[PDB]
Amino acid sequence: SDYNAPNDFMKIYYSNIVEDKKLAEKYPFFGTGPFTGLRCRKPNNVGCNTTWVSGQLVELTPKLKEQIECKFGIQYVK
Amino acid sequence: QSIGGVTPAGVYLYSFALKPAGRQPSGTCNFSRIDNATLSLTYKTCSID
Amino acid sequence: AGGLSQLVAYGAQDVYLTGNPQITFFKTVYRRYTNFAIESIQQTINGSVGFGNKVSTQISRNGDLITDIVVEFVLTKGGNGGTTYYPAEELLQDVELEIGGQRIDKHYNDWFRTYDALFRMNDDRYNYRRMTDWVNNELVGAQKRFYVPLIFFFNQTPGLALPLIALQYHEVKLYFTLASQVQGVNYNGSSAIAGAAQPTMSVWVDYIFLDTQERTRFAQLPHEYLIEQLQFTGSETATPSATTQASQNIRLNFNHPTKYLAWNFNNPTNYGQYTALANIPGACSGAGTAAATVTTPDYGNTGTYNEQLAVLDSAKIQLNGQDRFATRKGSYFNKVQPYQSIGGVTPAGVYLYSFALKPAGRQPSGTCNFSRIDNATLSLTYKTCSIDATSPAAVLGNTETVTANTATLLTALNIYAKNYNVLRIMSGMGGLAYAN
Amino acid sequence: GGLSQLVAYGAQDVYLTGNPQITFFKTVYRRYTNFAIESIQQTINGSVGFGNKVSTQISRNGDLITDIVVEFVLTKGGNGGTTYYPAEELLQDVELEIGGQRIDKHYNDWFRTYDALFRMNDDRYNYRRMTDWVNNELVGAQKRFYVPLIFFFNQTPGLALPLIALQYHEVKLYFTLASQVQGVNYNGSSAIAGAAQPTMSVWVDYIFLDTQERTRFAQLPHEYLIEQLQFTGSETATPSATTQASQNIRLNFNHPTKYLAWNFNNPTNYGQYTALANIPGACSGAGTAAATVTTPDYGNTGTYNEQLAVLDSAKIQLNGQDRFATRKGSYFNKVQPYQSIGGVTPAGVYLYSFALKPAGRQPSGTCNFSRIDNATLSLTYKTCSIDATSPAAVLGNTETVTANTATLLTALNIYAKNYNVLRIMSGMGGLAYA
Amino acid sequence: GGLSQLVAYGAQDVYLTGNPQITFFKTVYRRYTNFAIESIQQTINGS
Amino acid sequence: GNFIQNMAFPTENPYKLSGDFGNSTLEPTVTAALRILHESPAPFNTEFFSRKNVDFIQKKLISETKRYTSFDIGPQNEDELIMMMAGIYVQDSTFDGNIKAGLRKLNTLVIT
Amino acid sequence: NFLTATQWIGVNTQGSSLKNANYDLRADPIIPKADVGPWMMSSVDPNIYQKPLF
Amino acid sequence: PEAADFAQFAPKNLQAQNFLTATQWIGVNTQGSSLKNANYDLRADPIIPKADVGPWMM
Amino acid sequence: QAQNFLTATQWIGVNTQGSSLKNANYDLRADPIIPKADVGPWMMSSVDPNIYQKPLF
């Protein structure tokens, strides 16, 4: 291919393979109660009640949360 | 124990559920989380004329 | 008087042994250990088991750590007593150990034979033979289950137990290749044995179940294990002439800190044959009588301690153009090296040279780092193959520099190197550190 | 030369020699206490003879004791080939007591089983020399045999018994002598007329301590981690030409067990753990016209030929669940010893370890049977269909079968080896766990 | 399986496995001084 | 005047695993107790077998012995103390959720 | 009345594929999915939904 | 009452001795049950709140 | 008085090749010096940079 081009050495890898870093930093721990798989803050179920969308863990924010509640009524009790 | 009917010889059942004949889940074995699921059988000796 | 008369006999020379005593012998203190349990669990072997087939298994995660591995085989004799020689060892042609797709190690049937020849001993060696052969004069059709222990670093000690638990994301596999033919089982020399049974195989792994704090430590902490690997290549032997002494310079394509080199000369026709055939009771089929032949071994008695039937006259290891040590006779590698470094009896045709103080142990004790030697070579001088193998007077009454005319059948050379590497495990994954 | 190896140093060497901690080229010996060992004869109370029970009290002649050897003088009641470890057979059992409490108890069969599993190579041969006639001796030949005891204190100085710390308690051994010893006073079931009675003597090797070591032993409390043998005998399920017998034996054992050990035997013939057969060494007269498969070649009673053994397979079940997958008898006979001991176990003798190193002193994993209440040893026997008098059948047979004469192995001896603690204080002692 | 042995732990095992000091499943080899060994022929004086 | 004769007696036994409990990071002594009890970690158990409670008991045994007898004694070996605590704990461990009251009783029994 | 939507599992998700699973009846501590080194990395999903009963 | 305080006893430093013998509490149950400690369930077996109440609950 | 100072391995020679000849460049042009950076923690190799003492150009 092109010679005079950027070197895509693991750009795709840091962009969407490794960890969705912003979530990983905001929520450094994992739920241990039946929230397991969920990244979260503080202990076992303290800074938890974060979420999982179609494919990977994503922060539960009052955008996504509300859209989900409107279609799929979920209590989301921290 | 689980159905209350009578099963003919040669047909076997093992339930992972309290009430397998109903519709309401009453206990299940999730084989999507069991890498090895094995049925072990021992047969009778075919010696009778 | 009595025992007390010894205690009172105390002077200056004793100060060095018992003055201001530090220890005693009459009180043992033991170390407290962790809570664990061990279990033998059968693995599932994929592929079709039979002679010449390659089969494999993924070690199940049925414990936290793994150590001993024993491969069971069931074979039936294709002939009478004396036709087999460690047939279950011959059968398991090779075993490959892979973690996370990276080869950690790989052993060959010949290594198992070489390893045994050098490192097992006494009743351990005998009991070993009992698990791989028929040693009670069994007859044709006799059926036995053989147990071939593996000899990977984790199969030697709990200290190097493979932390299967610390490998939550990387599989550990065992690949097994079964020999196309096994002597005295499905073939007799080159002749197939009609009606011979195919082997039944089962792989057993001993899994260690750790209690909670210890289990957690293995599961969460990174680990670095200093472990051994086997390097191996086959070479053509500069087969000695019956008229002179052949010589050879063999490049040693080895790397890493090496504990020792080991090698043998052999006749690939007959598994375990490291020596020449001869018409003396311990060296050929029918040896000692009219029916004797020096083209076929008495298989059950394939090995021998008589170096007159071996082919190495002398050898040296050269590193980067410089001799490592003065050239020594083949008998020096066969008898003295293992005397000094192992303490057992090495059969004729099998040689050892240690770069280590205690190569039979596990604690590193001096190694030759072949990764820092630009060009290592093994230099051999062979014995003259002038002795008429069919004549005991010639076979037994000969000189240091000669061997049997049948010694020219020992055309293959197997050179092994056992070295150290490091198995590094972290974040659920692990591969041996050094690439080369 | 060697210097070319030293200079071959790089990154891969750091793990082995960087920032070195030790060397191999300088030994530091430790200064130790001043002590001496003296061999002192004890007196046996009562009278020595076949079938008698005698005992001895160990005198307070030294401070600590270790090795004990029981001497026996026997004369052959027949020719070479008629005896098998006769001094071992003679000492039917040995009890060990401290403070009048049972610490342990060994049986002639245990000594045979122990040997079968834990002794090896030359030490084992030498042991045989101390209990039998191994140079083709003839009738009337006289030998002094030395039967070492194998109680924990008889194996290592580290577990010597501090007689000095036992001011108010005695230490005693009790020896039961067999009513019959093969090739000495009986030949199979037949008494040997004119057979001599044994001469017996118990020797104890005492440790004499110097002033400071002696004083500490006398005033400080002492705790030893020791071994005990648990034992119970039972009938075997009897296999036959028509069936593979099976059996479930309750493992009536307790405490933290290093291992189980067991054997099947013909109680008629001491040390016979296998079937008789007309193959060399496997029966009296084996290999010739006079061969019989009702009597062993006593001098060659033992064998490694598993074809004459009766265990097809076994497993240990704890509280209803399998402890490990069922394995063949040859696993217990050949592999367990390979994996954990390094010796060679004769056919008919089996081992299962719960320990990494069952042959050593240092604890390396135990199964606590006082915390397991439904423990069972489950056995499957081989089919007894092989005509023992026909080598073609004896030697050319399959994994699941054995000799028709294997049905004579009607007794099973199950042993267990466990840890316990010997505690000594204020001149008294006993064991911590019942 | 083997889990039935781990649970078989009582008061009579406290001295053996409670508050463990060492394990048998991870060894640490000592780092040792670097050295090499060579077998060298000597000259014999006398016949 | 008896000082020397008393001083002469060693205070350090060359005991198997001397300094037996605590002095190790491989696993807690509390865990060992829980394992022989076959009980879950819980406030009642983690207070009763805690290092501070074991210490409390050891100090009381030493102090009370000195109060009751003329003798000065050492701390007792802790395999012996743990086994005894757990034994007593198994045969009682009776409380309604009041851990403190429960502990008071259990310590009383162990010390006694 | 929608079975496929909760706060713990997630919305529109299924169970991950099974490969080299823990055959033990123990917890088997789920180490965080860490990518260490640019080579021979593995792509297995940890058993985050394996309940730690023991 | 037995052993009249012996102040003239010299070895009063009995620190080198372990007097506790935990041989009677090896293998006990809750009160007096007999099930060989019953370590059957491979779990933690939580603490049961056994309150010392009378023959009835309330 | 003074005694002879036993020298180190400097009398037995100086290993110049080392492990640079295991994967030496066969081209006359000098290969670019690729530094020993981080290439993971468990699959490293140990040879040499193999820099030409004289670039020949």
CSV table of N, CA, C and O in Angstrom, one decimal, chain C residues 320 371-372 374 424 426 429 431-436, chain I residues 15 17-19 21-22 41-47:
chain,number,residue,atom,x,y,z
C,320,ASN,N,33.7,-21.7,20.7
C,320,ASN,CA,34.2,-20.5,20.0
C,320,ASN,C,35.6,-20.7,19.5
C,320,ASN,O,36.4,-19.8,19.6
C,371,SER,N,24.4,-19.4,24.7
C,371,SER,CA,23.9,-18.2,24.0
C,371,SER,C,25.0,-17.2,23.9
C,371,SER,O,24.8,-16.2,23.2
C,372,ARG,N,26.1,-17.4,24.6
C,372,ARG,CA,27.2,-16.5,24.5
C,372,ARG,C,28.4,-17.1,23.8
C,372,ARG,O,29.5,-16.5,23.8
C,374,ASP,N,29.7,-18.2,20.3
C,374,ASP,CA,29.3,-18.0,18.9
C,374,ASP,C,29.2,-19.3,18.2
C,374,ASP,O,28.3,-19.5,17.4
C,424,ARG,N,7.8,-17.4,33.0
C,424,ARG,CA,7.2,-16.2,33.7
C,424,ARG,C,5.7,-16.1,33.5
C,424,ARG,O,5.3,-16.1,32.3
C,426,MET,N,2.1,-14.1,34.4
C,426,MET,CA,1.5,-12.9,35.0
C,426,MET,C,0.2,-12.6,34.4
C,426,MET,O,0.0,-13.0,33.2
C,429,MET,N,-1.4,-15.2,32.1
C,429,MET,CA,-0.7,-15.7,30.9
C,429,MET,C,0.8,-16.1,31.2
C,429,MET,O,1.3,-15.5,32.2
C,431,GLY,N,4.7,-17.5,29.3
C,431,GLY,CA,5.6,-18.2,28.2
C,431,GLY,C,7.1,-18.1,28.7
C,431,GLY,O,7.4,-17.2,29.4
C,432,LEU,N,7.9,-19.1,28.3
C,432,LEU,CA,9.3,-19.1,28.8
C,432,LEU,C,10.0,-17.8,28.3
C,432,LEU,O,10.1,-17.7,27.1
C,433,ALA,N,10.7,-17.1,29.3
C,433,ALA,CA,11.4,-15.8,29.0
C,433,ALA,C,12.3,-15.8,27.8
C,433,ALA,O,11.9,-15.2,26.8
C,434,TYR,N,13.4,-16.4,27.8
C,434,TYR,CA,14.4,-16.3,26.8
C,434,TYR,C,14.1,-17.1,25.5
C,434,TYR,O,13.9,-18.3,25.5
C,435,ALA,N,14.0,-16.3,24.4
C,435,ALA,CA,13.8,-16.7,23.1
C,435,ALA,C,14.9,-17.6,22.6
C,435,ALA,O,14.6,-18.6,21.9
C,436,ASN,N,16.1,-17.3,22.9
C,436,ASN,CA,17.3,-18.0,22.5
C,436,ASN,C,18.5,-17.9,23.4
C,436,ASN,O,19.6,-18.0,23.0
I,15,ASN,N,36.5,-12.1,24.6
I,15,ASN,CA,35.4,-12.6,23.7
I,15,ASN,C,34.9,-11.4,22.9
I,15,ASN,O,34.1,-10.6,23.4
I,17,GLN,N,33.3,-11.7,19.5
I,17,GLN,CA,32.1,-12.0,18.8
I,17,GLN,C,30.9,-12.1,19.7
I,17,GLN,O,29.9,-11.4,19.4
I,18,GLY,N,31.0,-12.8,20.8
I,18,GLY,CA,29.9,-12.9,21.8
I,18,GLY,C,28.8,-13.7,21.1
I,18,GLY,O,29.0,-14.8,20.7
I,19,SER,N,27.7,-13.0,21.0
I,19,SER,CA,26.5,-13.7,20.3
I,19,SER,C,26.1,-12.9,19.2
I,19,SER,O,24.9,-13.0,18.7
I,21,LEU,N,27.3,-13.0,16.2
I,21,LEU,CA,27.3,-13.8,14.9
I,21,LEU,C,26.2,-14.8,14.8
I,21,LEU,O,26.2,-15.5,13.8
I,22,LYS,N,25.3,-14.8,15.8
I,22,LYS,CA,24.2,-15.8,15.7
I,22,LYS,C,23.2,-15.4,14.6
I,22,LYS,O,22.6,-16.2,13.9
I,41,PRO,N,7.2,-9.1,28.4
I,41,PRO,CA,8.0,-9.5,29.5
I,41,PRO,C,8.3,-11.0,29.5
I,41,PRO,O,8.9,-11.5,30.4
I,42,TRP,N,7.9,-11.8,28.5
I,42,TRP,CA,8.2,-13.2,28.6
I,42,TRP,C,8.6,-13.9,27.2
I,42,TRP,O,8.5,-15.1,27.2
I,43,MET,N,9.0,-13.2,26.2
I,43,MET,CA,9.5,-13.9,25.0
I,43,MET,C,10.8,-13.2,24.4
I,43,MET,O,10.9,-13.3,23.2
I,44,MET,N,11.6,-12.6,25.3
I,44,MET,CA,12.8,-11.9,24.8
I,44,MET,C,13.9,-12.8,24.2
I,44,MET,O,13.9,-14.0,24.5
I,45,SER,N,14.8,-12.2,23.5
I,45,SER,CA,16.0,-12.8,22.9
I,45,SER,C,17.2,-12.1,23.3
I,45,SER,O,17.2,-11.0,23.7
I,46,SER,N,18.3,-12.9,23.3
I,46,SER,CA,19.6,-12.3,23.8
I,46,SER,C,20.7,-12.6,22.8
I,46,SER,O,21.5,-13.5,23.0
I,47,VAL,N,20.9,-11.7,21.8
I,47,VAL,CA,22.0,-11.9,20.9
I,47,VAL,C,23.0,-10.8,21.1
I,47,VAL,O,24.0,-10.9,21.8
